[PDB]
């Protein structure tokens with residue numbers, strides 16, 4: 253009881269403290285859309301330049317997720333090895349989930365460098381299939397109309413995953429995961445939102461999208 257509802261409020265607080273982007277700013281900026289000439293500007297950048305600027309933005313978003321982990325009940329009590337394994341496996345997946353907040357399903361645009369643009373803005377990356385899959389993924393997640401509280405609890409579980417290969421204190425991650433699931437399940441049951449569980453994307457889907465070009469990021473500043 254009591255303890256579960258306390259865990260729920262602690263995870264929702266850690267999340268709100270560690271957002272890269274205030275929801276109210278993303279929503280207010282939805283009318284601020286890149287011009288054709290601004291899009292053409294992005295489409296003529298070199299593949300290298302466009303990967304450099306996307307790598308920089310991904311790194312910045314990852315730092316806010318590392319701060320989420322630091323503030324998450326139980327995380328900083330796991331062994332250093334397991335903290336590193338969970339972040340390395342989970343941090344980019346949490347960025348991908350956080351990005352459905354910055355996605356406008358009404359015109360299929362995403363917040364990027366101060367305005368909203370469609371997937372054709374990212375043409376110079378030369379990975380149009382991946383961009384289209386990230387847009388498709390965000391479209392599907394946007395459709396759950398997550399509360400900030402639901403996003404907090406869901407992203408806590410994306411991170412605290414006792415099946416990540418290379419964990420050394422597997423039983424201690426399982427104990428923290430189990431408490432987070434009881435927290436998530438209790439919140440959804442109480443709000444009558446338990447139908448969203450069957451709509452959450454498979455873990456293999458988050459993996460493949462978030463890791464398809466990991467080796468490449470190393471060569472960007």
Ligand SMILES: CNC(=O)[C@@H]1CCCN1S(=O)(=O)c1ccc(Cl)c(COc2cccc3c(-n4ccnc4)cc(C(F)(F)F)nc23)c1Cl
Nearest residue numbers: 306309313347348354362363364365461462463464465466
């Ligand atoms: C919304 N505001 C922001 O500042 C966002 C939050 C997250 C990143 N920034 S953003 O710059 O504006 C930004 C906003 C929208 C878009 Cl669609 C991109 C582009 O996305 C990606 C492009 C290329 C590769 C991506 C990739 N990846 C890396 C290695 N293998 C896969 C993973 C991811 C993902 F994070 F997992 F989704 N996105 C990727 C960026 Cl960068």
